[PDB]
Scaffold this active site. Sequence first.
Site, PDB file in Angstrom:
ATOM      1  N   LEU A  54       3.005  -5.049 -18.501  1.00  0.00           N
ATOM      2  CA  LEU A  54       1.921  -5.863 -18.128  1.00  0.00           C
ATOM      3  C   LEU A  54       0.628  -5.114 -18.418  1.00  0.00           C
ATOM      4  O   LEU A  54       0.632  -3.891 -18.619  1.00  0.00           O
ATOM      5  CB  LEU A  54       2.074  -6.041 -16.631  1.00  0.00           C
ATOM      6  CG  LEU A  54       2.423  -7.421 -16.123  1.00  0.00           C
ATOM      7  CD1 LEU A  54       2.999  -8.340 -17.185  1.00  0.00           C
ATOM      8  CD2 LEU A  54       3.403  -7.235 -14.995  1.00  0.00           C
ATOM      9  N   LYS A  64       5.006   5.034 -10.301  1.00  0.00           N
ATOM     10  CA  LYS A  64       4.967   4.736  -8.912  1.00  0.00           C
ATOM     11  C   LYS A  64       5.910   3.618  -8.568  1.00  0.00           C
ATOM     12  O   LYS A  64       6.648   3.670  -7.615  1.00  0.00           O
ATOM     13  CB  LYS A  64       3.531   4.630  -8.412  1.00  0.00           C
ATOM     14  CG  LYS A  64       3.075   5.941  -7.793  1.00  0.00           C
ATOM     15  CD  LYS A  64       1.642   6.379  -8.088  1.00  0.00           C
ATOM     16  CE  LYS A  64       1.504   7.069  -9.448  1.00  0.00           C
ATOM     17  NZ  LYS A  64       0.165   7.646  -9.691  1.00  0.00           N
ATOM     18  N   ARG A 141     -10.722 -11.588  19.037  1.00  0.00           N
ATOM     19  CA  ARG A 141     -10.986 -12.892  18.400  1.00  0.00           C
ATOM     20  C   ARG A 141     -11.799 -13.808  19.317  1.00  0.00           C
ATOM     21  O   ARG A 141     -11.924 -13.537  20.523  1.00  0.00           O
ATOM     22  CB  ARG A 141      -9.726 -13.645  17.993  1.00  0.00           C
ATOM     23  CG  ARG A 141      -8.777 -12.883  17.070  1.00  0.00           C
ATOM     24  CD  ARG A 141      -9.130 -12.986  15.586  1.00  0.00           C
ATOM     25  NE  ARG A 141      -9.336 -14.362  15.114  1.00  0.00           N
ATOM     26  CZ  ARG A 141      -9.735 -14.645  13.874  1.00  0.00           C
ATOM     27  NH1 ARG A 141      -9.965 -13.662  12.988  1.00  0.00           N
ATOM     28  NH2 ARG A 141      -9.899 -15.924  13.513  1.00  0.00           N
TER      29      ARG A 141
END
EC number: 2.7.7.7
Length: 327
Positions: A54, A64, A141
Amino acid sequence: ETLNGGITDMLTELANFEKNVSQAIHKYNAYRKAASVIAKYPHKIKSGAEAKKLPGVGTKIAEKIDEFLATGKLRKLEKIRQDDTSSSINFLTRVSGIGPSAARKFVDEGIKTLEDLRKNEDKLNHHQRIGLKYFGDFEKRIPREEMLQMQDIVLNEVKKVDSEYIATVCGSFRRGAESSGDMDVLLTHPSFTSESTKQPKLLHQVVEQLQKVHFITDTLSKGETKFMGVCQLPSKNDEKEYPHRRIDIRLIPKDQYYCGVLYFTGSDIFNKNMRAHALEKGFTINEYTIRPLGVTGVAGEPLPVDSEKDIFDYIQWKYREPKDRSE
DNA sequence: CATCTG
DNA sequence: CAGATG
Ligand code: NA
Ligand code: NA
């Protein structure tokens, strides 16, 4: 999405680390495209070589991946997850006001913790200080049940100062969401736009009000069109006071509210799709406007919007309630 | 991108 | 002013 998950995850850890601890923007950036590409990749990466295949995928990454695929782990990740110095930086960074940069300086001075920080409040600046004071509250939150109370307050005070103000609470709060991270308010006024040369009072007047009544507690940053602060829903009948919450207020020329409003409401995913469709529909969209696309390649000229409606209409689409603005 | 710090 | 933070 789960077929190359680990890979993408480790890669992200790696990427992250380069940038936060080491300074490796390049490298960091390297891990990123890498994860992006494997992320799209349609198959089960069964080996390095396969991956290398890729783009963005070089020899070191491939290495890795091998180790990782070969064993449930990776030495380097192993070493980094331990290392106190690395750890310290990820932590210090939690304080609002402390970035990586700062996190670095501090550690090299031995501040590695919260206490460290209190002890050295002198070295911290105002934002950073606040950050420290509200470390906990800030990580908590924000429940909708609170959101609605807040919203109820802000809009009522904006109202009082001027009937002409227009405020909107964007965010997921706006998209339904049961809780949120902070309160984001989009602000405008008829008397302020594109050309209209300024009106700073426009923002400051409100900010004041909010503090008038104590909804606003501290000022993180206050410019002429963006205010970064700390607010708090008055503690009722003393026994239960509320956590301090982050809040932002921002002035927007009226002529560009809804795109903005649209925009901030998200989700990112909603944006893009809408964004791309706009494109098909012979359009352009960003934070402040929607433009008619010429054929010559590109072209502009701000189409005129009176609501979130005008926009969709333009791109000839189904008006979407904020809830369904999901993806 | 807008604000701050120094 | 560069450079940091959100
Ligand atoms: Na921080
Ligand atoms: Na430079």
